[model samples]
Target: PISPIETVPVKLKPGMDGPKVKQWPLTEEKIKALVEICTEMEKEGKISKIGPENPYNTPVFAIKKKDSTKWRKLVDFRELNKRTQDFWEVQLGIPHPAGLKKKKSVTVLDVGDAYFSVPLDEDFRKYTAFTIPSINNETPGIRYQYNVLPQGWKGSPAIFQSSMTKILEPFKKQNPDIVIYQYIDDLYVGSDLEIGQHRTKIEELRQHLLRWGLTTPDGYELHPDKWTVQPIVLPEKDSWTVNDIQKLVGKLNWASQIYPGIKVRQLSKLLRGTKALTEVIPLTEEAELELAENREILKEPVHGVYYDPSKDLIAEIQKQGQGQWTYQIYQEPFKNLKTGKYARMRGAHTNDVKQLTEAVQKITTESIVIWGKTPKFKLPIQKETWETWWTEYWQATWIPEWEFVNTPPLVKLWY
Candidate 1:
């Protein structure tokens, strides 16, 4: 059984300010209601009872339902975030469905109560305490704190990303056929299996995810197995920061990587001052002119910014000249060398259904694994020995290796 109370300690940067707690006024009904929820969480071991109520308290606020009925408890962690140390935010780089390079079978999975799955250190957890009025009025107020990583905590995402990315490495190594993309709790698994193989491929992948500590057994989600590239029009702003310009450029550039079929060469060339400089800079006249030149194209997308591949799959997959691509589907039947009978009658990818009786009685488990004869890469990594070659490549160069490929090797699983 996988315990849900995993936690990571908060790291604070030097010369930063200490914690400052804020108080929130609560109505009587809210007070009782809040305590009840917290108490339930306490029993479930999601949160813990705290002391010295004055400890680094963060203010709590609530927004009422549109019906003006119930309230949602929200913590304001701005001060906490400001005082926390600066570190590179671990990017999950979870590829969006709209942006997958290979449009194959995709299954997205979500971690239940994502934040709560991460635990907080004993010393650091004190900084996340917030106060609420007493329900019975016997005491002034009760101080409750989170035992696990709180959703609004400043360092939650990075720490969790590191942990999860680290955790997912083994499964990634084990299932070489699956391409896994994750952003926080949302995980997208892509397999190049034929459309007919979706259920089994998803099941095989789901079972693996379950063994890796799934929050829900049935949490695997299916998305359309088609790729669609849509043109993104950056909103023209009268004024902008260098960071803003860079972000927009980076977004367009990233989009280019996904939709390689589309041309972003002109847009990519307009941003001259978007590299890594922090100095305040203004948009260039050249960029304005480029925007104007392309305005008729991007501004009014109804005029057709790009042909949607999803709606029409019959178009030339390539622009007179395009990058390398291989489209394949595996559903061909085979005759058993032993019995002189057809092993696979007819799957979806293969046209004929040909369903039947004892004439095709036995389908072995080994057959499922070996059924699909997808082409193997001529330059395939020698699986187990690939690491040795990678290590040699790293030591021979002074430059660092890719952080992703260079992530720390997995130890033992959480037994």
Candidate 2:
């Protein structure tokens, strides 16, 4: 049975006819899939039929899975969140590398259908109403709503995190030696020992988590396949429309997490402020070249820590070529997160560099000069370069390196 956590009221916009989005039409096959899921969830007490006279109703749409025909039904809660008071209580996420130090073994557990397992807050269930396509064409579509917390709601993450923390807190209090790190649906257990002791602690975590609604798949070395990102294809179009760029940007964002070495983070800025999805994507000449270079980077894979530069670095090649340059910094991935994990991981970053004579700055600020005559290889940053970085961020520490190192290892400056 789903457990109800603390309830909050839905503050609606004045005179707003709640969730007025139209239900997107679906194919016959899609309709069947949707019906099966809804019915199963209903039988499982996760969703329920709503009365037609109900006031609030949102539209439902399907999010197609990558390279597959399957779809995930989603409720459009855009208006709902806007009307609700911004009372979300922010909380800290996963701890830094030091927190997990010497934790020889690690377990990452993924709760099954996690969000829906939390019962909806009383009086707020009606506001979650949504319309879905009918099983029969003759009968008009039926109205239904979630009996549990819905996805896409802005407050769901914070709420879920809070709830899960309480659920996992007891184990933490009991097992002070075993480190427990909770991030919403994922629970991590770490121990300094390698085999017997760490395994037992993580297994105990799995058992305790199961008592709180997480399924059986919750065990040590959980989520063994979380990193396998399916192939994403960006359509080959000469000039990108708003829709094209929107989808392209979306795919690349996830792809960035999957393969941190691609250096797509800097390239993704090309689509930052499009007027609309229907309008043509505006691209400066440099942005156009950046896009081409990113596409080339995406062609091959590299495995290393992705270092986002503060600003444009003067890029230079030993070969005969010179132009404006954008740099993609890569470092070898940290293999272990324990027993000198921080030392190894932080060692690869530029921020840790203490010494600064002419060596580092000469390569960064001015240009990269090579031995032998190469016309004074001045790796020059372009005027008006987007080079200011708030901090050098590394998205992942232990990821697979690229299949091929497209760019050669070279030095440069950051002026």
Candidate 3:
């Protein structure tokens, strides 16, 4: 799971450095796991043999001190935000003055809307920044630039992160009410202001960034909302059961962290591996004959991106697009199947959701994959044979492919 913990108490734990949003520990997966744990709390007299001293509400458990037969109350630090040592300051490396002193207010802005259509091919690759030189300069055709899901490029996430840090630096001089922050485009702005004040700051931040040639898009969160903990962890009586947790694992990004000690065992296929099955499909004699006649599809040509006609369903789909599963939904232009159910274009630009779904369904289990799709690409890799193709185009060519700055161990997921 992306977040650090499953509950608010753990999130607002000691030594957390960033915003409460960053501090928010209740990842969807972990929440489910926490729900499971909480359930077991009721059913069993013991929890991993862990106990608390006084049933105090801090996340830090001194459980063994209390021995058995005691309730383990979840601790919430924010409740003590005023009484306790300013945790956000002392541990977060935040200058206490910055929290109290007057500073120039700057606005945070987005670079632009992510464009999946844009090919991350070689020419565009040069525009991507890297901390170190790529040995082969090879990248997976799949990549993610902000929300734009597309072919991978070795430097995609790093470059995207650089774009954010780079964009925010000069503005950092003026410490605005809306501060700049990012978790791959799921950005957060800091301010102690009310919603109206923060919204004004948001617009100003948006304007300044837009003027600087960056673009910001609409997002879900707002400031001050983070300041107040509106949705506190519900009591067991109010909270959903463990069954609900497992059922929604694959759906909520926040919930996935609920389960501990299990990662690949639950959602192995979705988290790892590629859509490689497309290459092994059995071919028919007729298909071979046609391929012999028209060698373009057979050519394995290294030219330009080819928009598969059969997959071009963008025109047919309308927004508010619905899916077969009642709860499942789709965006307009869903999977780009332009015409009817029977039709499917092949060869030039091959796209098959059926192939993907059929492959994924073999597993009776599903863990929540994020509510996002991988970006598409019509790549033209220079290759004459499969071996050369694999060696040249698919090999790892870069170190620290995530594009971190300065040194290794760049991320601090735990506090």
- Give the lDDT of residue 340 in candidate 3: 16
* Stretches of model 2 off by over 4 angstroms after superposition: 2-17, 52-83, 88-108, 112-119, 134-138, 151-163, 173-204, 216-415
For residue 19, what is the lDDT in candidate 3? 16
Ranking of predictions according to TM-score = 2, 1, 3
The prediction achieving the highest TM-score against the true structure is: 2
On TM-score, the stronger of 1 and 2 is 2
Q: Which regions of candidate 1 fall more than 4 Å away from where they truly are?
A: 1-9, 18-37, 44-46, 52-55, 59-79, 88-108, 112-119, 133-141, 151-157, 160-163, 174-178, 188-207, 217-415
Candidate 3 off by > 4 Å: 1-154, 223-415
Candidate 1: clashing pairs of residues: 6-118, 6-119, 7-119, 13-85, 21-57
User: What is the Å distance of residue 409 in model 1 from its true position?
Assistant: 55
Model 3: per-residue lDDT, tens digit, 1-415? 0112221111223463311211122223333433454445324422222222212222211111122422222222223232223222222212122322121322233232322222233322222211111124442211111112111221223234444456567667675434544422233455666556666767766776667555565333322221211110211211123333222223222322322222323222222344342233333454334323322321222123233413211111111112211011112322211111122234532333332221122110010011111212111112232212221111111111011112122111110
Please, what is the whole-model Cα lDDT of each candidate in the order they appear? 0.45, 0.47, 0.27
Q: Tell me, by lDDT, which candidate is best.
A: 2
Q: How far off is model 3, as Cα RMSD?
A: 28.1
Q: How big is the positional error of residue 8 in model 1, measured in Å on the Cα after superposition?
A: 6.3
The full ranking of all candidates by lDDT, starting with the best, is 2, 1, 3
